[model samples]
Target: DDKMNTAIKVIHTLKAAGFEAYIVGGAVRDLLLGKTPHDVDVASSALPQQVKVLFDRTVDTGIDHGTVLVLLDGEGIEVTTFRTESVEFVLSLEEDLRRRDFTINAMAMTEDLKIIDPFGGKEDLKNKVIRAVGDPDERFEEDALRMLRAIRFSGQLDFIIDMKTLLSIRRHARLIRFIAVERLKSEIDKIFVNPSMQKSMAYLKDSVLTRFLPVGGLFEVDWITYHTDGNPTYGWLYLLHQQKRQFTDIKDYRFSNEEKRLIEKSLELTALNTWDQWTFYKYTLKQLEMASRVTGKKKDLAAIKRQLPIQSRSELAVDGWDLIEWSGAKSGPWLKVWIEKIERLIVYGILKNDKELIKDWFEDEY
Candidate 1:
């Protein structure tokens, strides 16, 4: 009931305005499979312009593709006209569903809970399969992004790609180069984070799909040890490290600033050739540990890293108050440097972190 009620309400609103609408796409597929969908899509007989006029608040998101986002109660329900980028309003629900990427995703459910599965989508779902809607090659040519989407779906569901569909992906994998980096990044983020990622990574290499990715070919990978359930960026970094391939610059993949930081820290830490207290002190121990595991560092860096008296300045045995007393040092840019100096001395074991000892060092040094 909670599953489709919001979307159904949107459909009812559209119908009351003398237009037909039904739950479409992933929501319908997930519903029939007894899974809850995070988002719902509505296909309507009403044109995009009509949908906008009916809803008080609407976004023209993909409106040219016959999709309009109707906002109600902070929830956005996508109401798309029965059409594709090329075709006008289709005559029936089957025509709308037929244009989807896979058979399992090409089903719809009416407001009255009727299943309008034009293809054997229900059967394919039960069989744990992903098959192209019609001609597999033609489908990939229609949109190269679908090849990646097919792989992503298979990974998420741990379902096998139907043979014909799988072959089509391999043949058409090269077209992925044409996809926008942001779109490509989103799917990669989803795929790499899933535990089922292990089951699907080989498909990219086997189908030569990685060869066409913006990151270029992944020469080799140690899939045996890539079982981390951490951030999606961490897993991707680990794999890239194993492959010994690097982005000369973050700009290459158009990674976000935060994503760049994750990969930067990972790449910097994973290349550790020796134990350096300063290195562990400078970077987070959590990510350092992850990098050690990624690079197969066996000797306990733990043995040495724990000698750090404080994980951060807040845990320092001495404070700025003591520094003022020790050297009459007023707080400013100099104070910032002095505090970091004290923190570094303690971390590097160059001097004891005892309050009195730190005061003595500061007084003598000042």
Candidate 2:
């Protein structure tokens, strides 16, 4: 609601300046479908410079492409100037709506909530079908990433791709390799998280989009496993882990160190199936959550996390002092081993907060 309010303010400002402004793209599409828009993008006839003059804070996110980011109370909204692509061979939007991936996304709305449909986006939306604004091949050729976006929107909106569009995608699926891996990864991540991921993946397999990916075949088995009995989240984790393995196998493949570590951590969790409480405590909560989310076992993980005795070693009720006192030994390797033993027992649910029982175990073990 706050995002919509902010967007209305932007449109009002533009109108006052004698320029036509409308909420465009996903925001407009989402609103028509009774869904909350995540990012509000305003399209205007006003140039990026004109928008800078009207907004107090502006960032030239894509000045060359005639786009600017306007900040309202620390919220960033993208405002773009309307222009047709001049490139004879580029998949550029000759007009704002023409460059869009699907007809549903091509719809725009004014400040007064008047729908603009240069293309039949509204009709497509009502029909629950995803179709290109213009020629499907031309659109896919202009940007192969749009192919992935088409499937993503289908998953997000629970729509089916038009038969013609699907055939065109298959014809041009190989062109997807021309797109950057990082850009591809983002779309894949969104699809995995979407509620219709399993269905979208099924479409992906049918369209043969996965063949262009690094570890394309890995998903074939994963998909079958999921449809047979596996969970969607685990399927996502498997795909992610497979990608990491592919990256490692291909020496020329590039990945940032952090990315590599994330993959490794995911692989570790997948392999172990279960981790000791001490190990979980030692790891960051964010990573633990990621592991849980990917495994589709967030509830199980939350239960385990709730049972953690101490997030840090300092929170332990009994420390080196207790260990030394009970074991009758000095603070050295043996004392450290005895403390670790007690900590492990507590973590494994074998012991509770009974100080006497813990001291006895320490004494007997020593």
Candidate 3:
């Protein structure tokens, strides 16, 4: 929690400048739950331009969205200006918190670190329930993304969704289609990043959420009680594997080629229940371990890393060109045939993997 001290200093600077500043959003929620937050945000009465003048190192990360980045002592914190849709120039801390999606996140922290919870947010936090800042339908209508976050936060915290909020979500679920898959993918990605990933998927499947998502109605969800322990990659692999689909093969979701490749590789690992001694060496040790975790069959990967003489044909004592040189054979189908045969021999301990020995083997075979 000491990591927040520098951010607290940032708050004091704003306070000294005659501005009402408080640490807000996820940070306050996590603090109430005794968890360390990864990102910290501050809501201030100062305008974006006023905030810019206060910090020597300021980044206009989302100025139009009422956010400014204040860097202090090498730590970066997001400082957002108080805003309200109802007014062109009017603003207050309560109005800013009201615009927030959930009750738990609507709370703010003062310079002395006391919470300023106006919407029964502290009570909702204590009870582990996700409730809207005000009218659920109105909130979701203001920003469709809040509909996704409402349920995502419930899954992330393992908290129950307020019945009123759940009803609103079900009613407005179809609005999710209006959002671009590009921005929506990141929010969906965070849910699976937790150990309770299955819970999130189950919640989506049991209701109208997925029906509106890029997934549409094609996904057949397999619900499980077990948790994933922060491996979003595994959760995604499991989900995609259940659908018998590759991650990038989707016609609905718009993911980058890199995203698809990584997920595809992870799914390949899930299909493996046991390690191929030779194949394990094809990837780095970390890759092997990561794949092992996804498949739920882990062992001391180090115990057998040295069992194979060479990890691949390239590492073989003799390669295709070498075979052609020693055997004086044309570099054609025969070379490929000899390469696989020789590589197989080395991988299986049938040969010593020596250059001259492999040359003799290829020479005799050719």
Candidate 4:
């Protein structure tokens, strides 16, 4: 990918300029696992200002945090300077990685792919264990969002969190509200869409992450466990809808209209008890297509795709004018009713582009 090539070139340039640079964070983690990394993040010894001097197209994305965005042929790669933060704040590069909820994500890699192990993250990764770097409570207090991140990583990597970190997450569960809801929402959304989401939900229950969430009690461990073995997507969709409703009503959280529509679609699919053809046609096809691509479910999604036809309100074979003229209704409420009736007919396959059939049905109904 262009991003990867740009990242490698930047790292090489930094090294030639007598600065230490490495492909770092999640990219390193994924590369180590033999998976294709999504975004390439580089950590460097060069300060943000000094890095900017080397690159013509650099944005001070987080200059205060020692991060610079280097644009290479229209692709931006983030390069952050290395520094250790104070014991209390936990914001430094070392502190940030240490404070990460899982050890699998704590490991960093150099330009040559030499794994750095400041916290035994390599062993933890091999064992499929998610352990905290140091004092779990201190790490979590530095940023309560780590608690949610723990489960998110568990879902993403199919790893189990260590007991100590899990207990610390439970102890600091209430502190999650101290973190921004939007940040929390992003993590929850990632968790919900992950293939191993049920495992993450299990971690949420065991770690008490859900206790701080708006609809904690609605998600039962047994139900999720059962559904995981059978249908993880449905289980995730069901829990997500429940949580979304609670967030909207109890927390008075404002979600975008698109978010509401997606949540409603999930709820509708869950109510139907399967990824039915009609359900896929009406809802899952669009919202889930990208998700399927990312989560390695593309083949399964493609199989489901064959069962349904492309659906759109515009393809109902009747328009407002047709409704008005055929039903002999004025340009008002009766016209709307006719349109709704036609939509129902379209859904049931009773209405096609056959204008004569539609007119006859409209006349009979009116």
Candidate 5:
């Protein structure tokens, strides 16, 4: 709602300055779908400099691409000049809309909520179908990223792909290989977190674009493994597990070190199937949840979490140093094993996490 307000102010300012402006792209599509759009983009006939001159506060966010960020009330609204292509600015709003990736995203709207459906985006929206702006093949060839976007929108909006559009995507899916790996991963991340990943996966399977991705064997990932509530990490974990791949295998999709660790830990937990006090202590609740989703196992993680006697070895009453003093053993590999054994004993509730109790237990056990 705040974004829409900022967009309206931008459109009004541009129009008063003799430049035509309208709410454009995904914002308009989301409005028509009775949903609150995440971001509102304003498209105008004014050039980036003209937009800067018209607004009191503006930042050249992507000046070369004809975009200006109009800051209002601490919120920045993206305002872009009308463009027929990526580099060429145009004066006609219709031409700008014509270059959009999908029909649903091509429509624009006025401040008064008047719909500009030159490409029949409203009809396509009502029909619950994802269609290309014009020729689907030409769109994908112009920018292969649109092929992935088409499937992402299908999953996001729960829409079906137009038969002609789907066929065109299948034909041009190989061109997707040219897209930047980060760009492809960005779209895939959104697809994985969609409300209905299966819907997107269905379209992705039909499009066959996965076969050409830098990540090999993605096309073989089964759709049934997807969960509606999982995030991008969960999605990647399931994908890697299904393909019998590891994070080391992914070079193009740059995952953070933390993400790689989570995937590895979750995969290990999934393999174990059964859990112990050690497993509960070793993995986080989030990791356990991810593994549960991957294995299709419903776990009472909250209950198990409450069952942990000590969350970490530090929480144990004794440390490796304490073990050394009690056992009269020097610091070595054996101290590490002894510490874990003490931790497990405490975790399994076999002994209380007390120094005296652990000291007595250690003496009797050894």
Candidate 6:
């Protein structure tokens, strides 16, 4: 609501300056759906220079693109001058909204809560469909990323892609290869974690957009059975397990270093057919659960965790210093191995993890 309040204030301020302004794009779409948008955008007829003069605090966030950040109460509200396909300033809001990618995101709301739907964006929202604002081919030509964006929205909003729009995407699917890999990776990442992943994947395949992606046979999977708990790493693990492949050229998804580590850890866990106490201690609960789910092996990770005696080396009753004192030996490379042996014994429940018990055992074993 704070975002909306600032957005309205921005609009009112622009309107009082004898310029037309309204809440536009995804913010309006979410508002109409009774959901709070993460950010707000204001579209106005005022030029970037004119808008800068009207606001007390303004940043030329995208001056070349006619966008300015109007800071009010420390909240940054994006205000972009209306534009037609030329990217130059346009006087009419209808022309600006018509150039948007989808009808659902093309609607605008005035400061007084009036809905301006020149292209029936409200109808598309109510129908739960993603329709291109105008000719689908032209929309994709303007920006091929919109094709993938359509699929992303389908996954996020659980909406269906309009038949015509999907067909157009299929026709121009190859154009997606020209977009930057980082941008494409970002959209696909969202698709993997969205609520309706299966639906989105189906569309991605049917539209033939996957052919252009660096997925390395990922579309060959049956995603209906896959469960994405809103984590992209889980989806990646599932793909890696199902494909039975290790890191190859397909790592081109441009994963962060930490994400790559997580994927590798999950792969290591899936190597063993069954888990033991050592496995439970080596892998985190999330890693174990995701690996088990990928392997179709159900496990009560919590129960196994509760049965473990220690979680880490810090929890071990004995340490390298204690070993040195008990064995009367100087610290050496062997000390690390000795510690591991003791850790293993405690994990297997062969030795109780008590300080006195470990001392006696160390004296006998040495």
Clashes of each: 0, 2, 2, 0, 0, 0
Candidate lDDT scores, in order, read 0.79, 0.74, 0.76, 0.69, 0.84, 0.87
Order of models, best TM-score first = 5, 6, 3, 1, 2, 4
Clashing pairs in 5: none
Q: Write the per-residue lDDT of candidate 5 for residues 181-278, one digit (tens) a residue.
A: 88988998898889887888777776787678785456456777467565788888877788777667775688878888888899888779578878
Which residue pairs in candidate 2 collide?
Answer: 84-94, 85-94
Best-to-worst lDDT order: 6, 5, 1, 3, 2, 4
lDDT string, candidate 6, 227-264, tens digits:
77788778777777777887554577677888887788
Task: Indicate the worst ten consecutive residues by lDDT in candidate 2.
Answer: 224-233
Question: What are the per-residue Cα lDDT tens digits for candidate 1 across 1-366?
Answer: 454777888988888998888888899888877888988988889988988888799989687888888888768888888885365778677777777899988888878899888789999999999999989998899899888888788888889889999898888888898899888878877877777787677776776788888754552465767775657777668767876666453356688777777777878876777657778778776667667777777566666666676667777887777777767656666777788888888888888878878877887888
Per-residue error (Å), model 6, residue 111:
1.5
Q: For residues 204-247, what per-residue lDDT tens digits would candidate 3 score against the true structure?
A: 76658878887655444664633564645555566666677776
lDDT of 4 by residue, 48-97 (tens): 88899899998885888778899987888999887543323232457547
Provide the global lDDT of candidate 6 against the true structure: 0.87
Give the TM-score comparing model 1 with the true structure, all chains together: 0.82
TM-score, cand. 3 vs. native: 0.86
Q: Is candidate 2 or candidate 6 better by lDDT?
A: 6
TM-score of 5: 0.90
Q: Give candidate 4's root-mean-square deviation (CA, Å).
A: 6.0
* Candidate 3 lDDT score at position 102: 92
- Better structure of 3 and 6 per lDDT: 6
Full-model lDDT, candidate 3: 0.76
